[PDB]
């Protein structure tokens, strides 16, 4: 089965899940309302921003239900119920939202005829990343260690491709914009860099650790919440700030 | 009925949760994207919003029916006696497929014959779904003859719909700007790929596999619905955005 | 009591009821949104169109609850619960919506001073039709065959009156409009003609058939759904198309 | 209490479902009809929307109370011990009747005395409902004296309200266009027919019949509420539309 | 414990609570919609009017739940359940809404530089009134009669202060406005005078009466509903009427 | 755990119901007050609406948790075994405190450094709440050392936030009209009074009292949240209204 949890551990994970739910839905309303403030050519990017956090809001709402249904209160403790709580529900979120995360960045940036081509490759790359990752995630890290490693390696190839394209296609376009736009674009890269590495690490953790003890279960689940809120809601605020800065630069800010 | 492995139940549940999320995301897009395109293409986005709203609620219900048809016992998911209503999609299609045809006609240029053309497609789609329904609920083992016959009878209006869409979309490519032309070409390919997937899943259910067959049919129908409705609506929006940039009606 | 049903039969009726619910509510949103597109003198007719489908949406929502509450799952079967499922709940729908169906047609057509008089007679006719039909519907087709026939006959008199008025007041006004308006008005008559005959036939069926077997129960209930969706939602789309055509003819289409 | 036949329970339930549907339909009409009339008559339609919205929810509750007060046993509907709160309409009237008077005053031309006139009618309507409430909950058999007395005391502000409405509506007929005049004449007749129906139903409940009496009172009150609120609001809208076409403020 | 109630007594209190709920929420929608009709300098007062009735709507919704949960149906009777129904939940309503009631009156009236000072004193007075009243309300009228009286007396001091300020600050400003504004301002004072005295009387009743019998329980609870609807919803209508009259006087009525 | 008197349970429940009502009232104010101030200050009111909306729902949940953690027995409220999640506020603060800082920055004049300043405050607020959380769930009796340490570590970013707000608000007083200046002065005092209250309640929970301690912490946190969010948002609105009257953008 799984691990027994204290009220403190169960509450901590439940609260970080409720933190995630509130952050995604609140950011949704913010991005919906923020459309009126930026230039008209950057409003489609904010719509996609709202879409990302809306979907992750729905998915975290289900995860929160899944978490409370996998444990039951007995003798001042939370003991498993047999109902499964898995990380593979997250992939259903990622498969849709990660291609959308790339889309909103490209839409807020300048289109250079090939912008469609650059986006299409990244979307296809992100899809294959999650798609190849899924067989490895549902594989038993012990009884199926060969399959887990193979899919992880195959999944990492389009992953580094996305990271490479973002580094090379952003710096060549960072150095063409005002100082405020550069800082916003620069930090957005760091934001992607710091946060997106969490998911493969936890995948590699299950292969070489994690599940060992309740604290590991809490930490990983707390980590997913922090990573998702920053990679989706905070990331969407950066897209909004880039839209306002670029709208302020080309003179399209509503007056 | 049959017992499922933990993986099979999880997989079908996830594809159902994927479908719910895709519709919810597509709904918000079409509602908000209405403001971004020209004023004469917004009714097409209104119909797009309804299609995904209806299918979203219906997939929300399908997910409830799925989780209620199995129970976890001994590391397995065994049936509960509560039935899984697989015919619930066909009543959705009976409403949403006629609506999908409408949004394509509305996003295109209105002609004199547009009224007659739409009604014929809807009558075909109705007869298609109507003939398919006896075949869908037929037992693939004890009632294999009826499944094929209704499958065969249903494809006649099916191929009729595909022919009309191919011919009425190619005739409009050569009158529009290049960007509008590319979108219409890809839209034809998209309709063919997605609408052709459903006959395969019907033939998948017919032929035995066991639980893998159950997973495939539910996964296949779910993917088909998501691509034929939400991905399809994005093309309707993209056609609306291109035509709005061409006729100078883009709100920007 | 009543009949026992298979899962297939119960599901079929349940699905056609859910089809009806979705069609009525979806058409409501369509007609509400479609007001902006037609001329201002035809928008009141679309409001009445929305009202018809909204009411039928509410009534079919209750019918769906009534259907699931009249049967219970036992041994892979649906056996009655004793709770009644009757066609007389439909008359409460018809008594309000049928007068409204006539109203929206007259409002989309040209007012000719007497338009109030024509409408008032039809509304009074439709009311008496449903009102006279109700005593006959709740009468036992066997133990009370005299009362059933008498009310059916009395109900058919204002029915044919409505049909006569529609045929004579529409053709005299069809031949005064453009070709597209004529086709729309012509098909609307056929739509009324084909669909409205279903209700008396089922009334006459209960007198001389139906209730015999489960298949009859399914067919009649499936028929009501098909008839209601076409006589209310498809009919409202025809009213919308007439409004757009007439708005396009008199030059009032919003530009 | 008393047992009801299947027909009696069904009839009262249907008239309650008729009332719910009528209010829901009337609500959407007044909300949407606000946009169609002139800008100075829209607050009257706002109040119209509230009246039917409040009464719709209340009739939704009355229906729940009705179905919860009886149970199906032996081809009969026998009481459950759960009570049916027939006084729930009077607390509705205490709110909605003062609102109904307001929407009539708002749709008419505002004068200096309009403020005083409205307050007097509301005070009368309050006292009318207030005196009627002791009489409504009084037992028609063991407490027949109190029922009549409260009925008698309640009609004094009742006839006061009817007199004022007759006199303030006839004085405004002769200053308006012909179409506005006809509407005001019919509005007076409508108020008299509908407001007079309630005293009959109170006298119906007093005098015994048994279950037929129970059906009549509930059917009568339901019909009276539907005609005095939703049908009444359509006249308020019709007066608004006529005055908007007369003063040139029709949004068209 | 408490008293046993008949179905009639329980229904009466339940209905007057549902009357209060409907009146507060309905007035909320009225004040929200009524903003468009008055001058722009009086619209903030109507927002505060909506706030008062919205809060009292929420609080009466809870009181209605509290009432149904304090009694249970047994043998055609309503007997207590042990769950408490107290008047001290009302103070949580009053502590917020009474300062708001004064605010909306001052905002609809003319600001005379010191209007902030006058309002601040009244708000501080109203707060201390409810604050001093609370220790006395939760005191046992019999075992704690010294504390009940003392807090009641201390609570009455800012109460009469508010009444004095309203009488003196309104008449000096009534006699500066048109006749219609004077009548509206004059009746608003009478409205405050008649209704606001109910609360101390019921406080003094618990000290020297009430709780004796079920009829007293019904009357007091019925009284609170009548008092709250007139002191909040009817009072807000008077504020709306003053705003429309003053907007009509200074020529700011939307045309 | 500990049993509570009827008064203690009622008091904490009332302060929770007070908090719910205050947030609901504040939400409607900020939504409606958006229309009343100038167009460039409305995003700050949008964020104000979210803060109170989030905290309103969370206090609605806290009230449910509170009533579910005790049961009435023998004229007492005794624990039920169902736990009261007191850490649920800290996850609220983790979202709402960063939002509260934002609305202040948005209502003020935007400068070049405004971007950097906000991010530092949010990082501080995050670390503040993050370090406070281990201390909040620590047992005041068996784990008194950890409570103090996390309390001590949490105040470092706390005093950092207070210093920045004092210095960036005094620098903006002397560039604005007198009415704007007074509001900014009082806003500083308000932030200090309310933000300083939380450390006291943490020290209250640490030091024993018993149930009175439980009441104080819950009452203190509730009052602190209501004044630091709803009362704070009214000042944000008042600053918005004053600046709108100064720059001539008041919708009137
Ligand atoms: C709905 C329940 C029944 C289900 C069965 C399928 C119903 C299909 C209905 C299609 C409505 C299409 C009406 C189109 C009327 C013309 C509108 C139009 O041409 O507008 C173009 C543009 O918006 C001008 O600017
Ligand atoms: C077993 C019984 C089976 C019964 C099966 C019945 C099916 C009826 C559906 C017909 C399709 C009608 C589509 C209607 C679309 C009309 C659109 C229209 O008329 O608008 C054109 C005009 O140009 C705008 O101005
Ligand atoms: C509501 C809870 C208590 C129930 C007790 C009954 C309350 C009756 C209230 C009536 C409000 C009427 C206020 C009318 C104020 C004048 C508005 C007006 O004259 O506006 C006309 C027109 O809209 C300008 O263009
Ligand atoms: C047992 C205790 C029973 C107590 C019973 C108390 C009843 C109080 C209701 C009075 C009616 C008040 C109606 C208020 C309508 C005012 C409308 C108004 O003042 O507006 C006019 C002005 O012209 C706009 O500008
Ligand atoms: C939200 C979930 C994560 C929680 C972590 C805290 C997030 C803090 C986000 C702040 C958004 C601020 C974006 C501001 C972008 C600039 C907008 C602006 O300057 O607009 C001014 C004015 O409206 C022009 O007229
Ligand atoms: C245990 C792990 C702990 C991890 C902790 C991670 C915390 C990340 C939060 C950083 C604050 C970011 C605030 C972002 C505010 C940005 C606002 C902005 O960029 O807008 C300025 C520009 O002027 C508009 O045009
Ligand atoms: C894990 C948490 C990590 C910390 C997350 C919150 C801090 C984010 C601060 C962003 C300031 C961005 C502008 C910084 C300007 C000074 C620093 C700098 O050197 O920026 C060079 C750039 O060219 C401009 O001048
Ligand atoms: C500033 C831009 C973003 C900056 C980069 C953000 C990246 C976030 C990713 C992973 C953090 C995971 C942290 C996991 C910390 C868990 C803390 C915890 O509570 O674990 C203790 C456990 O509960 C004992 O039982
Ligand atoms: C069968 C005939 C009528 C029944 C109702 C048929 C419903 C479909 C009507 C299609 C229609 O009205 O055609 C529009 C016309 O082609 C645009 O000018
Ligand atoms: C404009 C709207 C027009 C809508 C037009 C809809 C036409 C019929 C569609 C679906 C019927 C679905 C039920 C089909 C049943 C097939 C018979 C069958 O064998 O299955 C069920 C039966 O009860 C054995 O148990
Ligand atoms: C185009 C304009 C409208 C055209 C005219 C539309 C009129 C619809 C009225 C009645 C149809 C009733 C059809 C009933 C078919 C029932 C099919 C069925 O499924 O019954 C099999 C049963 O389930 C085995 O057990
Ligand atoms: C009793 C007197 C005042 C108590 C409150 C009475 C509430 C009703 C006030 C009616 C009113 O204010 O009259 C409006 C005036 O006639 C328009 O000019
Ligand atoms: C502006 C708002 C003003 C509103 C003004 C409302 C005035 C009173 C109305 C209804 C009271 C209903 C209860 C009446 C009770 C009558 C006494 C009675 O005998 O019945 C109940 C009693 O508990 C025996 O059980
Ligand atoms: C016009 C401006 C406002 C005018 C002033 C309004 C002040 C309302 C305050 C208190 C009234 C309390 C009245 C309580 C009446 C209770 C009637 C009742 O029903 O009690 C009988 C009991 O139920 C038998 O068992
Ligand atoms: C750590 C650095 C980047 C990770 C993401 C940091 C998120 C906060 C970014 C803050 C920022 O972008 O600064 C705005 C700039 O100062 C306005 O010109
Ligand atoms: C932009 C968004 C950035 C958000 C950044 C959030 C950073 C961490 C915040 C809260 C963690 C709350 C849990 C802290 C747990 C402390 C460890 C502990 O001892 O308690 C739990 C443990 O499971 C013993 O049972
Ligand atoms: C909002 C959610 C986001 C940004 C999720 C991102 C997920 C990844 C970048 C996952 C990467 C993986 C690999 C590189 C290999 C192992 C499998 C994955 C899917 C965890
Ligand atoms: C949104 C749903 C859509 C677009 C559904 C489309 C469905 C089809 C094209 C179905 C076709 C079928 C046949 C050709 C025969 C077998 C039965 C069907 C209904 C699966
Ligand atoms: C939306 C619902 C509609 C259009 C319903 C129409 C119903 C009828 C035309 C019913 C007619 C009847 C008779 C002519 C006699 C027998 C009784 C009736 C009510 C079934
Ligand atoms: C929407 C509800 C309305 C218009 C209700 C009106 C009610 C009456 C006019 C009631 C009158 C009564 C009497 C004259 C005496 C007997 C008791 C009443 C309350 C039924
Ligand atoms: C909407 C609610 C209102 C206007 C409540 C008003 C309450 C009072 C004026 C209460 C006054 C009290 C005293 C003067 C002393 C005794 C205690 C009080 C709180 C009942
Ligand atoms: C809306 C909620 C707000 C503004 C919360 C503010 C909270 C604090 C300023 C908390 C400070 C703390 C310390 C300084 C140390 C002890 C732990 C805390 C979190 C209570």
């Amino acid at each position: 089965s799984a691990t027994t949890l204290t009220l403190q551990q169960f509450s901590t994970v439940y609260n970080m899940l409720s933190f995630a739910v509130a952050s995604m839905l609140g950011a949704f309303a913010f991005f919906v309302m923020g459309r009126k403030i930026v230039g008209p050519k950057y409003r489609l990017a904010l719509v996609v921003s709202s879409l990302v956090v809306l979907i992750a809001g729905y998915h975290y709402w289900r995860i929160m239900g899944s978490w409370t249904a996998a444990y039951a209160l007995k003798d001042g403790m939370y003991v498993p119920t047999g109902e499964p709580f898995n990380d593979a529900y997250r992939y259903v979120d990622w498969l849709l939202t990660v291609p959308l995360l790339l889309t909103e960045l490209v839409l807020v940036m300048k289109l250079k005829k090939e912008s469609g081509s650059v986006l299409a490759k990244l979307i296809l790359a992100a899809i294959a990343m999650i798609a190849l990752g899924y067989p490895g995630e549902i594989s038993n890290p012990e009884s199926q260690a060969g399959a887990r490693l193979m899919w992880g390696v195959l999944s990492t190839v389009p992953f580094l491709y996305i990271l490479y394209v973002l580094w090379v296609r952003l710096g060549d376009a960072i150095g063409e914009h005002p100082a405020k736009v550069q800082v916003l674009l620069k930090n957005t890269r760091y934001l992607i860099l710091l946060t997106w590495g969490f998911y493969p690490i936890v995948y590699a953790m299950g292969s070489y650790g994690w599940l060992g003890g309740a604290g590991s279960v809490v930490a990983v689940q707390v980590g997913y919440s922090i990573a998702d809120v920053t990679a989706k809601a905070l990331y969407g605020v950066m897209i909004f700030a880039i839209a306002y800065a670029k709208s302020e630069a080309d003179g399209s800010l509503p007056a």
Side-chain angles (χ1 to χ4, degrees), chain A:
Chain A
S1 56
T3 318
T4 312
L5 305 178
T6 73
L7 280 32
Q8 173 170 345
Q9 293 166 326
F10 181 83
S11 302
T12 293
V13 178
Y14 177 87
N15 292 159
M16 284 325 277
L17 295 174
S18 63
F19 172 76
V21 172
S23 302
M24 305 293 185
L25 295 184
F28 177 73
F30 187 74
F31 303 147
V32 172
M33 289 286 183
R35 294 181 300 163
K36 307 160 221 276
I37 299 184
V38 295
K41 317 141 301 309
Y42 307 102
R43 291 175 187 174
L44 191 60
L46 297 196
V47 165
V48 177
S49 297
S50 73
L51 296 180
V52 171
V53 287
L54 180 66
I55 300 178
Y58 163 75
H59 279 309
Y60 263 94
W61 179 62
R62 306 303 312 278
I63 290 176
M64 199 170 51
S66 201
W67 177 255
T68 63
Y71 299 88
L73 185 62
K74 297 189 186 64
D75 296 324
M77 293 287 304
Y78 282 99
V79 315
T81 58
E83 311 285 344
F85 186 77
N86 287 332
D87 287 357
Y89 191 72
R90 289 194 142 76
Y91 286 60
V92 169
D93 177 25
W94 304 346
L95 188 65
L96 201 179
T97 55
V98 172
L100 291 193
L101 287 172
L102 297 166
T103 297
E104 68 187 66
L105 185 53
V106 163
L107 292 187
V108 81
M109 295 183 76
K110 286 175 55 63
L111 312 181
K112 301 193 291 86
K113 323 116 193 183
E114 56 191 344
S115 54
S117 164
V118 181
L119 183 59
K121 296 169 188 163
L122 293 163
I123 294 180
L124 294 185
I127 287 179
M129 178 185 56
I130 308 293
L132 298 178
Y134 191 84
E137 170 71 356
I138 58 185
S139 295
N140 194 340
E142 284 81 342
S143 80
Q144 296 180 53
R148 192 159 179 91
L149 182 55
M150 181 197 62
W151 292 111
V153 173
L154 297 171
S155 187
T156 310
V157 182
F159 170 67
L160 297 174
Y161 169 75
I162 297 172
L163 297 187
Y164 173 80
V165 174
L166 290 184
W167 209 255
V168 178
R169 206 46 150 261
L170 237 275
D172 302 358
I174 292 176
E176 308 171 354
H177 284 81
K180 61 166 185 171
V181 178
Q182 299 192 62
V183 177
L184 294 175
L185 296 170
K186 269 272 188 179
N187 298 152
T188 308
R189 289 198 310 187
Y190 296 151
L191 178 63
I192 299 181
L193 191 69
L194 301 152
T195 56
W196 282 32
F198 179 78
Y199 305 95
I201 291 181
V202 178
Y203 182 94
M205 281 192 160
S207 183
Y208 307 132
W210 189 35
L211 311 138
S216 78
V217 175
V218 176
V220 166
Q221 298 305 312
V222 170
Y224 277 124
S225 302
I226 299 178
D228 282 334
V229 172
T230 61
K232 292 180 171 71
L234 202 75
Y235 177 84
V237 170
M238 291 294 309
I239 297 293
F240 177 96
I242 294 176
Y244 185 94
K246 297 189 63 172
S247 295
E248 191 176 4
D250 57 10
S252 55
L253 264 194

